Amino acid sequence: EAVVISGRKLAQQIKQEVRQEVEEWVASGNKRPHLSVILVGENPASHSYVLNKTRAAAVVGINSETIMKPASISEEELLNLINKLNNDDNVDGLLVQLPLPEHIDERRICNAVSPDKDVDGFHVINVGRMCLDQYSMLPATPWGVWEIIKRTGIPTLGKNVVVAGRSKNVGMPIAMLLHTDGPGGDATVTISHRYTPKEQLKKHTILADIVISAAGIPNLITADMIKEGAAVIDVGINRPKLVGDVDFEGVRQKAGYITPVPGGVGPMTVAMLMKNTIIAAKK
Amino acid sequence: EAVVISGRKLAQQIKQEVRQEVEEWVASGNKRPHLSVILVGENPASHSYVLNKTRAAAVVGINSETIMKPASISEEELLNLINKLNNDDNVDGLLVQLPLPEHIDERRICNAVSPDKDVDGFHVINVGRMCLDQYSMLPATPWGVWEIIKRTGIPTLGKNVVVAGRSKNVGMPIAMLLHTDGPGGDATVTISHRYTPKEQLKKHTILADIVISAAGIPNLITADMIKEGAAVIDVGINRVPKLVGDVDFEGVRQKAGYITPVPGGVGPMTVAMLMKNTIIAAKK
Numbered sequence: 001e002a003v004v005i006s007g008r009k010l011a012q013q014i015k016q017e018v019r020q021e022v023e024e025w026v027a028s029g030n031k032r033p034h035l036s037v038i039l040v041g042e043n044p045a046s047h048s049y050v051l052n053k054t055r056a057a058a059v060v061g062i063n064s065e066t067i068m069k070p071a072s073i074s075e076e077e078l079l080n081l082i083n084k085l086n087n088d089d090n091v092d093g094l095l096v097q098l099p100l101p102e103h104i105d106e107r108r109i110c111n112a113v114s115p116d117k118d119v120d121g122f123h124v125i126n127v128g129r130m131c132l133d134q135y136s137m138l139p140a141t142p143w144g145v146w147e148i149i150k151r152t153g154i155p156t157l158g159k160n161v162v163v164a165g166r167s168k169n170v171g172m173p174i175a176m177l178l179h180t181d182g183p184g185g186d187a188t189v190t191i192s193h194r195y196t197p198k199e200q201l202k203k204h205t206i207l208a209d210i211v212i213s214a215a216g217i218p219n220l221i222t223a224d225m226i227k228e229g230a231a232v233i234d235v236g237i238n239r240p241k242l243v244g245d246v247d248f249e250g251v252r253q254k255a256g257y258i259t260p261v262p263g264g265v266g267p268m269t270v271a272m273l274m275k276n277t278i279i280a281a282k283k
Numbered sequence: 284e285a286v287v288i289s290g291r292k293l294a295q296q297i298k299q300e301v302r303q304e305v306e307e308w309v310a311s312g313n314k315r316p317h318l319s320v321i322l323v324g325e326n327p328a329s330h331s332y333v334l335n336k337t338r339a340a341a342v343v344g345i346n347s348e349t350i351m352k353p354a355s356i357s358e359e360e361l362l363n364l365i366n367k368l369n370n371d372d373n374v375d376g377l378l379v380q381l382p383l384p385e386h387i388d389e390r391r392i393c394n395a396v397s398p399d400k401d402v403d404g405f406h407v408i409n410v411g412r413m414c415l416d417q418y419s420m421l422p423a424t425p426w427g428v429w430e431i432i433k434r435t436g437i438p439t440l441g442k443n444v445v446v447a448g449r450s451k452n453v454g455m456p457i458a459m460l461l462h463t464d465g466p467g468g469d470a471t472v473t474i475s476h477r478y479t480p481k482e483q484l485k486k487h488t489i490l491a492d493i494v495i496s497a498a499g500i501p502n503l504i505t506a507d508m509i510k511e512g513a514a515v516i517d518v519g520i521n522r523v524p525k526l527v528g529d530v531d532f533e534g535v536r537q538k539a540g541y542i543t544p545v546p547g548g549v550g551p552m553t554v555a556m557l558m559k560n561t562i563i564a565a566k567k
């Protein structure tokens with residue numbers, strides 16, 4: 001029987017560590033950290049997730065607002081709002097929720113956020129710093145996947161990792177961290193492209209000590225694809241239920257570890273954003 | 284037996300394209316592109332490599348200077364020199380040949396090159412732009428390996444690529460390009476760590492349609508690790524008094540479907556792609 005890692009529990013604990021770090025920072029006579037989340041449009045999933053982010057900001061003692069704007073906002077307007085927020089000394093953390101509308105260039109928006117306030121780590125210089133190990137802020141989801149592995153004590157040195165990426169933005173940062181020298185990880189890493197058929201993907205996943213699915217494909221990962229005792233992290237959201245890319249009940253029989261959906265990586269993602277926000281608040 | 288890709292000949296057409304581009308660009312009455320390369324110390328390999336680069340610049344119509352500073356230069360004086368060049372409007376391309384002396388932090392030096400002049404793409408902003416598909420300029424050796432593959436017409440989409448990196452600096456940018464969406468080849472990519480047993484690597488390379496070795500250990504790649512018709516691309520540079528790659532050239536030439544020699548393989552491609560980055564930089 002595979003042991004199930006409660007992401008929700010591990011993330012709740014991380015918030016408590018952040019909680020106490022914020023109260024110490026404030027008791028020592030500094031300003032309360034403030035996180036701003038910009039929400040454009042009415043994607044219901046984006047609302048759900050941004051709600052989760054401000055909930056957690058409240059739990060850990062961080063002041064938060066979600067500035068919601070209509071989907072018809074122009075790129076020039078969104079840039080002026082980010083400029084306002086960049087220049088407000090009360091705002092320490094600033095993230096724009098994605099995806100944005102087609103008439104806004106996502107690259108230009110993320111690059112407009114101050115790198116000091118970029119609690120998603122999506123500004124191009126914070127991407128470079130992460131590739132080059134000059135960072136102080138990691139993107140929240142890849143960092144959350146690392147914390148699962150690390151806090152669980154799943155060994156990584158030399159081991160084989162396979163990541164099944166829906167995009168480069170989604171799987172490469174996970175691989176980035178898990179491949180880097182000792183957050184190191186010192187692993188051989190495979191990043192699967194969504195144009196590799198599942199038949200070939202199985203050829204890689206069976207060699208893997210850790211399989212991390214980030215493909216957004218229900219039942220992409222099943223027991224035949226996994227080796228005995230391997231660790232399986234599920235990063236996919238797939239929608240009247242919400243499930244991951246793993247066949248949970250199937251691979252629960254042969255995996256060594258597994259994360260559930262919901263209650264796995266998603267809480268960890270929100271947790272790591274709190275760590276980034278207090279980091280930003282200390283300059 | 285295996286087709287042997289000539290890096291010399293591939294680079295030759297790439298260089299011919301750059302000469303045409305440069306002359307049409309000068310024909311419109313623009314400043315002739317200029318490249319400055321800073322050479323610290325007396326590493327013989329490094330002087331050889333910088334010379335190759337200045338030769339290529341001359342023959343493609345790009346003016347060039349190599350500024351040789353002694354190893355005992357201080358990090359401060361090197362940063363002053365980089366600052367002068369960043370500000371000189373005649374200088375379009377600036378690169379610092381690596382490695383540097385132990386007393387200088389290569390990371391601060393590389394972030395001191397203006398990102399507009401950074402024809403190696405080693406500045407932290409340009410590393411991010413390449414990660415994020417936002418770049419003007421790609422690191423020469425990864426781009427060179429890509430052009431080998433793409434100009435030889437080796438299929439990549441959904442195929443299995445294995446990269447054997449000596450360091451993350453080396454194999455990650457190569458993997459990054461081949462894993463990207465269509466440069467960018469839509470491929471599955473494995474990046475072996477230097478901390479990898481040869482037989483564990485074997486378990487991945489056997490499955491590989493493209494093995495790219497950049498580990499700097501000779502005979503790392505032998506035929507027993509390739510599958511028939513796979514493409515093997517040798518990025519290593521080893522001494523054994525002879526210069527050789529990471530593959531067993533003779534043995535893999537039977538099983539492989541494609542193979543690159545060393546020398547005359549990836550090396551000349553690296554020099555060629557740096558000319559492309561230079562005309563790009565000049566155009567802003």
Ligand SMILES: Cn1c(N[C@H]2CC[C@H](O)CC2)nc2c1c(=O)n(Cc1ccc(Cl)c(Cl)c1)c(=O)n2C
Nearest residue numbers: 098099121122127139141168169170172173414415
């Ligand atoms: C824009 N973006 C996203 N957005 C979308 C949000 C909507 C979802 O449905 C799919 C992901 N997720 C990112 C990044 C990002 O920029 N980075 C930075 C980064 C770091 C290293 C490297 Cl190598 C690279 Cl390529 C990129 C990340 O790490 N993650 C997870």
Ligand SMILES: Cn1c(N[C@H]2CC[C@H](O)CC2)nc2c1c(=O)n(Cc1ccc(Cl)c(Cl)c1)c(=O)n2C
Nearest residue numbers: 131132381382404405410422451452453455456459
């Ligand atoms: C410093 N450096 C070096 N040094 C070489 C190491 C081998 C020595 O024998 C000669 C000096 N090679 C680099 C970089 C670099 O910074 N970048 C930028 C980059 C882009 C994407 C990603 Cl993901 C990453 Cl990690 C890094 C590269 O692409 N290459 C090939």
Ligand SMILES: Nc1ncnc(O)c1NC(=O)Nc1ccc(C(=O)N[C@@H](CCC(=O)O)C(=O)O)cc1
Nearest residue numbers: 048049052096097098099120262263264266267269
């Ligand atoms: N798009 C973005 N733009 C900017 N920065 C970002 O990080 C993102 N990406 C996310 O924010 N990703 C994310 C995914 C899931 C949750 C989450 O709360 N998951 C829960 C419940 C799911 C549910 O109940 O619907 C679970 O799985 O347990 C939170 C954030």
Ligand SMILES: Nc1ncnc(O)c1NC(=O)Nc1ccc(C(=O)N[C@@H](CCC(=O)O)C(=O)O)cc1
Nearest residue numbers: 331332335379380381382403546547548550551553
């Ligand atoms: N260190 C660096 N610092 C800053 N930016 C860089 O890009 C590098 N790296 C290189 O510049 N790498 C490089 C390696 C080999 C050649 C080359 O010409 N190889 C020939 C002849 C072999 C020989 O004469 O030794 C061949 O293999 O055919 C050219 C460039």
